[PDB]
């Protein structure tokens, strides 16, 4: 698999080199979002946690379409304050419960080395 630890201080440098294929070798869920929350990349481990098919959710809006349970001040609110600011680095526990067995996760959101893109990293707790 691809050798990077969840929560590493330089994760955004490591992931800058990865295409879709390599992203699927990570030990944790990874989603790349634009500044509006649209999904640009979604890896296999994320699909394993949530049941979503990665190919199919690319292009959908994470907050409006895919993950309405995250449309709250505690998740989306943190994201949109990060985008507006141009900096984002926060880690918190959350429960994902939309059309799925409720599943408790650790979430890490971090601004990418790109441009106007943002990472959401997910693992089970």
Please report the resolution in angstroms: 1.7
Q: CA angle 71-77-80, nearest 5°?
A: 110
Q: How many of the other CB atoms lie within 10 Å of CB of 120?
A: 22
Which method resolved this structure?
Answer: X-ray
Residue 92, CA atoms < 13 Å, CB-side half-sphere: 15
Instruction: Compute CA distances 66 → 1, 37, 63, 81, 125, whole Å.
Output: 27, 10, 6, 20, 21
Contacts of 66 (CB under 8 A, 6+ apart): 39, 52, 57, 60
Q: Tell me which residue of 46, 62, 48, 37 sits closest to 117, measured CA to CA.
A: 37
Instruction: Compute CA distances 45 → 51, 54, 94, 104, whole Å.
Output: 10, 9, 17, 15
User: Cα 103 vs. chain centroid, distance in angstroms?
Assistant: 15
- Say which CATH superfamily domain 1-125 falls into: PAS domain (3.30.450.20)
Domain ranges of the chain: 1-125
């Amino acid at each position: 698999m691809e050798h990077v630890a969840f929560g590493s201080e330089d994760i955004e440098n490591t992931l800058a080199k990865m295409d879709d294929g390599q992203l699927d070798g990570l030990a944790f869920g990874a989603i790349q979002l634009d500044g509006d929350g649209n999904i640009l990349q979604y890896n296999a481990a994320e699909g394993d946690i949530t049941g979503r098919d990665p190919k199919q959710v690319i292009g959908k809006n994470f907050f409006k379409d895919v993950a309405p349970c995250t449309d709250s001040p505690e998740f989306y609110g943190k994201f949109k304050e990060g985008v507006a600011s141009g900096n984002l680095n926060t880690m918190f526990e959350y429960t994902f419960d939309y059309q799925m067995t409720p599943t408790k996760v650790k979430v890490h959101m971090k601004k990418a080395l790109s441009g106007d893109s943002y990472w959401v990293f997910v693992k089970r707790v």
